[PDB]
């Protein structure tokens, strides 16, 4: 470019629930700081030329009641928990998604 960069360059990344009190508003700002946007939901996704889709997660304040247990079926993007936003904005670099995407594995306390 010229005067700008950004780590992202042309990214789509949607914050679903509430989180705790913060990775909300302050999530979609600090991913836009790095050269992604903001998305209002899963659908809002469009394939223009250089925007990937990517999606955000938080098994926190989201509890149980509903069932977490069909993120990626519900979304047609990766999920991965504010720790990618906040690892990628603190450094500053587009992290692996899959060090905070849905991990999904047999059994669960052993």
């Given at each position: 470019?010229?005067?700008?960069?950004?780590?992202?360059?042309?990214?789509?990344?949607?914050?679903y629930?509430?989180?705790?009190?913060?990775?909300?508003?302050?999530?979609?700002?600090?991913?836009?700081?790095?050269?992604?946007?903001?998305?209002?939901?899963?659908?809002?996704?469009?394939?223009?030329?250089?925007?990937?889709p990517?999606?955000?997660?938080?098994?926190?304040?989201?509890?149980?009641?509903?069932?977490f247990?069909?993120?990626?079926?519900m979304?047609?993007?990766?999920?991965?928990?504010?720790?990618?936003?906040?690892?990628?904005?603190?450094?500053?670099?587009?992290?692996?998604?899959d060090?905070?995407?849905?991990?999904q594995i047999?059994?669960?306390?052993?």
């Amino acid at each position: 470019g010229s005067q700008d960069r950004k780590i992202f360059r042309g990214l789509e990344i949607c914050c679903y629930g509430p989180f705790t009190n913060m990775p909300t508003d302050q999530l979609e700002w600090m991913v836009q700081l790095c050269g992604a946007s903001v998305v209002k939901e899963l659908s809002s996704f469009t394939l223009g030329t250089g925007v990937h889709p990517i999606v955000v997660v938080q098994p926190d304040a989201w509890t149980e009641d509903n069932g977490f247990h069909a993120i990626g079926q519900m979304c047609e993007a990766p999920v991965v928990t504010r720790e990618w936003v906040l690892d990628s904005v603190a450094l500053y670099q587009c992290q692996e998604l899959d060090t905070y995407l849905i991990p999904q594995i047999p059994h669960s306390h052993y």
